[PDB]
């Protein structure tokens, strides 16, 4: 079935990073630190090297005295910790991480948050969807999975699992990048990573929205600890939906990947004798309308809030609005429900 997604495992890629894993960012691409860069254009084999390059460029390898081969092992473990569903794979975590690096390079993050908080945001970006199965939180509960048994009573099933997988990698032999960290700082990292990963659940975003709005309405406070907590949540959700800030071709390809993933879950729910949500039912979903709704209600407010706090982020919101206008303009060519027989949106 289209719902079966494999895990890589349980030396040549490590030695390659040990050879020339730290390359100056400009050698990767002259456009690498721009909001016009598309990290999905980077070959998958060069992504682990780009992670190190961004960490070095932000100076986190020297500021935190991170042992380079420990970081090389950790990155490869994070990469290996992703399965291969159409959307929630390593290439998604890599692109989300790159956008966190873009926010640091283009917005003045050091003038809003502590070095430790931005470093936590980046690491959380790499880990935020670890071991994702191509299915959502409702599916875990309905399929009565081990993950639902462990976490449903606490809420955010997948997000708690993703954080647990990040902790397991850290507690693996030679992957603890924070090994030399002090007891209070090591725990600070674990606590930041937990809140940041939990902020990737839509349910959470929907609950903190009024508070995000009020923070932007009043104005950011560099001395207010709660303001640092709320900013990190908005920044995490902006990294997670960052493919919408790119060109039309990226939003069109990401729609193709997410609906292939959503539709496979729906087919699995139908085989289980359950009725899927409309967006997960290939016989009911009309992708342009679903995209417009997702962009109006979820993506556009997140970037509108980011524009209110960071003036330099205005271009991001306008690209998201433009992509939304593009889906309305294209809806006349897309006259069918679901995806075409070949799973491609290239015809648009």
Ligand X SMILES: C[C@H](c1ccc(C(F)(F)F)cc1)n1c2c(c3cc(F)cc(S(C)(=O)=O)c31)CCC[C@H]2CC(=O)O
Q: What is the DSSP letter of 89?
A: S
Residue 205: contacted member of Zn ion, ligand X, Mg ion, none (CB under 5 to 8 Å, by partner type): ligand X
d(CA 332, CA 348): 10
Annotated binding residue at 129? Answer: yes
**Contact between 159 and ligand X per CB under 6 A:** no
**Tokens found for residue 295:** 């962009």
Residues 129-158 within binding reach of Mg ion (CB under 5 A): 129
Residue 25: contacted member of Mg ion, ligand X, Zn ion, none (CB under 5 to 8 Å, by partner type): none
Binding track, positions 204-243, relative to ligand X; x by CB under 6 A: -x-------------------------------x--xx--
d(CA 40, CA 311): 26
Binding track, positions 26-65, relative to ligand X; x by CB under 6 A: ----------------------------------------
Burial class (CB in 10 A: 0-12, 13-18, 19+), 262: buried
Report the nearest approach of ligand X to the CB of residue 175 (Å).
Answer: 26
Annotated binding residue at 243? Answer: no
Binding track, positions 182-201, relative to Mg ion; x by CB under 5 A: ------------------x-
Could you confirm whether 326 is annotated as catalytic?
Answer: no
Cα separations (Å) of 85 from 76, 119, 147, 173, 198?
18, 28, 18, 28, 21
**Tokens found for residue 313:** 């982020």
Nearer to ligand X, 240 or 281 (CB): 240
- Give the contacts of 176 (CB within 8 A, at least 6 positions apart): 70, 74, 170
* DSSP run (H or E) holding 299: none
Report the nearest approach of ligand X to the CB of residue 293 (Å).
Answer: 8
d(CA 264, CA 280): 8
**Contact between 165 and ligand X per CB under 6 A:** no
Q: Residues comprising the binding site for Zn(2+)? A: 92, 128-129, 240
The catalytic residue positions are 88
């Amino acid at each position: 079935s289209t719902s079966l997604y494999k895990k890589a495992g349980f030396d040549d890629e490590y030695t390659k990073l040990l050879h020339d894993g730290i390359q100056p960012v400009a050698a990767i691409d002259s456009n690498f630190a721009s909001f016009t860069y598309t990290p999905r254009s980077l070959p998958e084999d060069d992504t682990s090297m780009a992670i190190l390059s961004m960490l070095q460029d932000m100076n986190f390898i020297n500021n935190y005295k991170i042992d380079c081969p420990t970081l090389a092992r950790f990155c490869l473990m994070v990469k290996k910790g992703y399965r291969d569903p159409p959307y929630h794979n390593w290439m998604h975590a890599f692109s989300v991480s790159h956008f966190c690096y873009l926010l640091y390079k283009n917005l003045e993050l050091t003038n809003y948050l502590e070095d430790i908080e931005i470093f936590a945001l980046f690491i959380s970006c790499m880990c935020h969807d670890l071991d994702h199965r191509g299915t959502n939180n409702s599916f875990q509960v309905a399929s009565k999975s081990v993950l639902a048994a462990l976490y449903s009573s606490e809420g955010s099933v997948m997000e708690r699992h993703h954080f647990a997988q990040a902790i397991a990698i850290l507690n693996t032999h030679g992957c603890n990048i924070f090994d030399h960290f002090s007891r209070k700082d090591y725990q600070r990292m674990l606590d930041l990573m937990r809140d940041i990963i939990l902020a990737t659940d839509l349910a959470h975003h929907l609950r903190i929205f009024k508070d995000l709005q009020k923070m932007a309405e009043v104005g950011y406070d560099r001395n207010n600890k709660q303001h640092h907590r709320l900013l990190l949540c908005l920044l995490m959700t902006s990294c997670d939906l960052s493919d919408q800030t790119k060109g039309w071709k990226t939003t069109r390809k990401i729609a193709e990947l997410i609906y292939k993933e959503f539709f496979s879950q729906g087919d699995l729910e139908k085989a289980m004798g359950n009725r899927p949500m409309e967006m997960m039912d290939r016989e009911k979903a009309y992708i342009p309308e679903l995209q417009i709704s997702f962009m109006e209600h979820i993506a556009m407010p997140i970037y509108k809030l980011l524009q209110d706090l960071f003036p330099k982020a205005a271009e991001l919101y306008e690209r998201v609005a433009s992509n939304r206008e593009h889906w309305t303009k294209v809806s006349h060519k897309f006259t069918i429900r679901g995806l075409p027989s070949n799973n491609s949106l290239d015809f648009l």
